[PDB]
Amino acid sequence: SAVQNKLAALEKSSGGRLGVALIDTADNTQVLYRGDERFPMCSTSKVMAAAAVLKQSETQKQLLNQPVEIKPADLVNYNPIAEKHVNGTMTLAELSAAALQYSDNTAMNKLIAQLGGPGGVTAFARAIGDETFRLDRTAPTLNTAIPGDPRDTTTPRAMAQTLRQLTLGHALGETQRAQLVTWLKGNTTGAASIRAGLPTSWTVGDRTGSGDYGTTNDIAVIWPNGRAPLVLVTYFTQPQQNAESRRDVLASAARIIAEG
Ligand SMILES: *C(=O)[C@@H](NC(=O)/C(=N/OC)c1csc(N)n1)[C@@H]1N=C(C(=O)O)C(=C)CS1
Fold this sequence. Notes:
- This protein is α+β, with helices and mostly antiparallel strands.
- The protein has one domain: Beta-lactamase.
- Helices cover 36% and strands 20% of the residues.
- The chain is built from 8 helices and 9 strands.
- The chain has helices at 2-12, 46-59, 92-102, 105-114, 118-127, 156-167, 174-185, 247-259; strands at residues 17-24, 29-33, 39-40, 67-70, 88-91, 153-154, 203-211, 215-223, 230-237.
- Strand 7 (203-211) and strand 8 (215-223) form a beta hairpin.
- 50% of the residues are buried.
- CEFOTAXIME, C3' cleaved, open, bound form binds at residues 42-43, 77-78, 103, 105, 140, 143, 189, 208-212, 245.
């Protein structure tokens, strides 16, 4: 397709490896670029973890208000919200918001711990039909993004299908799906990523990720106006261990999708 040549040229003009999956929920048509290659998910894995806790809350009705202690030993590499509540508590709802809206890695680990370890996150993926997602490590080591490492990876096609079901489908209960939508719409870390490539009149919720090898990720659900919503995954990683972030590549991929 014309879009695929447009993305291949963007990739060639980036020096790295680009993966894209778009779901047009008008006719279930899809645009895929390296859609079945594995990419390090990095902090985009927070969507699966937060959704898995939301699924638990369908049975445990008060689970989101459960306080969780934040201890000095819980702190890791990037802790913007959790560091404000050390020696106190945060609720699972507050931890979910911190993970999904500020990329707080301590919050992600509290979600993982609530699910019984990384295997509890992968389990929820399999329970909703995602046979590709795998979470193997806690934060921050899940973001090492080493070329060829199968750990903590998924494919663009699989993540796009999962994100649809979580945010627009019925993989979650209605109150839970709406809460995840509110959290994603309120993300603060995505202004330079997919959001920067789309028309200003489209509503977006997304969740970014980054890691070594200049790994720069964003997954988003997009509501243009008066038409069927979109689901877009843009993953990008580079050959150099110390490569710089390239959020502009995700913005440019979204623009290219949006054109077609
Ligand atoms: C998720 O992607 C998080 N990334 C990391 O913690 C990384 N460290 O892993 C050892 C990392 C290495 S280089 C880099 N840019 N991140 C958090 N995610 C984001 C995000 O939204 O991209 C952050 C900017 C805070 S770290």
